[PDB]
Amino acid sequence: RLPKPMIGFGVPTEPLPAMVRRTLPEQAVGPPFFYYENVALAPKGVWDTISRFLYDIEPEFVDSKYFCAAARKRGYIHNLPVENRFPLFPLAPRTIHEALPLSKKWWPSWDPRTKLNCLQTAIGSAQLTNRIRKAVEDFDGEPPMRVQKFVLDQCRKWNLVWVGRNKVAPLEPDEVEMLLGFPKNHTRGGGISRTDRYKSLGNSFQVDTVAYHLSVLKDLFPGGINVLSLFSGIGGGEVALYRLGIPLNTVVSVEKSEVNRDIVRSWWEQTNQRGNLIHFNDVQQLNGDRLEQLIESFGGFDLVIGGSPESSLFYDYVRILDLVKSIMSRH
């Protein structure tokens, strides 16, 4: 199934695994590079399917805990050079202590969490926190694993952290934004509600992880790149490239969520990007006719990137990848 340590072809912080290199089908190679992500713990044959349609390339499984304080198991399918990768600096917090310095005066002896579980879209009610306190207000103890494993399992699933005496709380949006490697208040703005923030963050790249894989693009494109981002979310791929110091000449972003679109746009404006951000609402309108003239106007895409959301939407990733890949092959 999945590997010893989910370190893919290697992580900066750890000793290399046995297989450090790959050879890949000459269909897979050539312009453009592509990068697809999906949840690692997937149902049967799902990864078989994804692989079959992506040139039978073997997916790279890495846990993002090797890059930050939050664990997150993903598979990545790409034709990127695996050699000469480098980690993204400024370096992200590796532990809860580093990520949340003030949380450690309140941290019980029996909570061994040095890493956070996967960050997700919904969040523990005020009730749960009040309840947990009630459970452990009996003090002087370490009270039995009934109470402990209850609290620990609840803290694990909701990512609850100690912020007071016998008191837990969900991660604030900007604590989440930082564990995922986004700018502070990246998702904050306009009409965006609190729960909208959490939802957008729940489904998004861990920027530090993604940056490590995309780092090999920097030496390859000193003049900048054109990016086609499918299912852009809150711009995780584009932020990784910007933090990597790779100029974004042109970016075509396909993104159905309005909130997600505002977030990316504001980011493009706040960072004072000088390239073009071109947006489309639905992936189903990137037809050949359009792609033809995008590529004609702004040159070919050097990278097409996307993550998994509708389960048939994956086939549109495949459909757009090769439309692009075919158009960019004309002798």
Ligand X SMILES: Nc1ncnc2c1ncn2[C@@H]1O[C@H](C[C@@H](N)CC[C@H](N)C(=O)O)[C@@H](O)[C@H]1O
Task: Note whether 318 binds a second copy by CB under 8 A.
Answer: yes
With contacts defined by CB under 8 A, name the span among 19-27, 108-116, 182-190, 268-276 that binds a second copy.
19-27
Two tokens, residue 171: 């991660």
Q: 53 vs 110, which CB is nearer to a second copy?
A: 53
Write the CA distances from 165 to 106, 134, 168, integer angstroms.
6, 11, 8
Burial class (CB in 10 A: 0-12, 13-18, 19+), 265: middle
Task: Note whether 326 binds a second copy by CB under 8 A.
Answer: yes
Task: Note whether 56 binds a second copy by CB under 8 A.
Answer: yes
With contacts defined by CB under 8 A, name the span among 15-23, 172-180, 244-252, 313-321 that binds a second copy.
313-321
For the CB of residue 203, give the shortest distance to ligand X in the complex, in Å: 4
Q: Which residue has the tokens 């940056």?
A: 211
Q: 124 vs 236, which CB is nearer to ligand X?
A: 236
| 3-state SS class at 33 | strand
Q: Kindly report the CA angle at 254 between 281 and 34, in degrees rounded to 5?
A: 160
According to DSSP, residue 281 is labeled S
Q: Which residue is nearest to ligand X (CB)?
A: 233
The DSSP result for 108-142, as a single string, is -TT---SSB----S----HHHHHHHHHHH-S-SS-
Q: 4 vs 44, which CB is nearer to ligand X?
A: 44
Say if CB 314 and CB 50 are below 8 A apart.
yes
Q: Of residues 13, 27, 195, 271, which one binds a second copy by CB under 8 A?
A: 27
Task: Note whether 55 binds a second copy by CB under 8 A.
Answer: yes
Say if CB 32 and CB 304 are below 8 A apart.
yes
Say if CB 233 and CB 200 are below 8 A apart.
yes
Q: 271 vs 284, which CB is nearer to a second copy?
A: 284
What is the size of the binding site for a second copy (CB under 8 A)? 22
For the CB of residue 315, give the shortest distance to ligand X in the complex, in Å: 11
Contact set with ligand X (CB under 6 A): 203-205, 231-234, 236, 254-257, 260, 281-283, 307-310, 313
Looking at residues 252 to 281 of the shown chain, list those that interact with a second copy (rule: CB under 8 A). none
For the CB of residue 47, give the shortest distance to a second copy in the complex, in Å: 14
Indicate which of ligand X, a second copy, none lies near residue 236 (CB less than 5 to 8 Å, by partner kind): ligand X
Q: C-alpha dihedral over 182, 212, 280, 222, to 10 degrees?
A: 110
Q: Of residues 287, 296, 297, 299, which one binds a second copy by CB under 8 A?
A: 287
